[PDB]
Amino acid sequence: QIYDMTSTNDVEFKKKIYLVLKSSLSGDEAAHKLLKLKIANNLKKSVVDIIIKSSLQESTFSKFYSILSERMITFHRSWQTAYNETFEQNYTQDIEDYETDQLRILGKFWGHLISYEFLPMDCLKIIKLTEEESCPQGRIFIKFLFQELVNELGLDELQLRLNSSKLDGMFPLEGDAEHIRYSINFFTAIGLGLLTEDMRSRLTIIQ
Amino acid sequence: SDLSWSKQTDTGITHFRAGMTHEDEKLIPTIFRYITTWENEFLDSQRVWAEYATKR
């Protein structure tokens, strides 16, 4: 019995996907190919890992990888859980690596999935803004996310989504002064700052 | 997709038709993958020249 420290079993499966992906005009005919392989539920978790990466090597964001996922997320609910779980793996573990450029490609990539509801938006619950726990790269990830997530919806429609999503750690209204002075500080810098108009009352009352 | 209806609605893509015959699973990458589309370049040049000017 032989342990394998080689990834040769895996590397063969990064090719197969990446080549299916670098053929294929448009994204709907590269979503035909993947769904035509009938990948096992074991790997379907880690096929999304490849698609996100091949998105980051691409030097700019594209609508290909968006619609490739959109056609795929609606196919079967097993791929619902593959993107939902890989938005957590990125934000927590895998943001620590990325250059300030590849955060601009991720931000727009989870922008189209959230703003069209494919994600949905309660999967953004993990985002927590504190001085204590945040990666500076983690901050840049959100900055690019809302710049995208505002553009489509328009910041008036965005409030309608944020108000229904009961985001706690991200929009704390309950106390902890510095945190609300922080969250407010953050969204003024991004250039939206209207989402804080509600929270700007809670400071002055507590102040 | 639907040569008869495509004169009216824009049915979308219902079907695919084989372009050239590539034996079995062997897939050759096409150009349109390796060229960044014009929007993405203009929305890049916006930010890139803006930032250049700020740094100057």
């Binding site: 005919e29 979503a31 056609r71 196919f75 | 040569l3 219902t14 038709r17 084989a18 015959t21």
Partner: peptide, 27 residues
């Protein structure tokens, strides 16, 4: 079956004319 899709025939084609339904676009 030929349900209105594909080609009149594959002769002038340059392709085989194999038509397959798309898995992506259904719902």
């Amino acid at each position: 079956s030929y349900n209105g899709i594909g080609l009149k025939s594959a002769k002038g084609s340059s392709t085989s004319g194999h038509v397959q339904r798309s898995l992506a676009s259904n719902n």
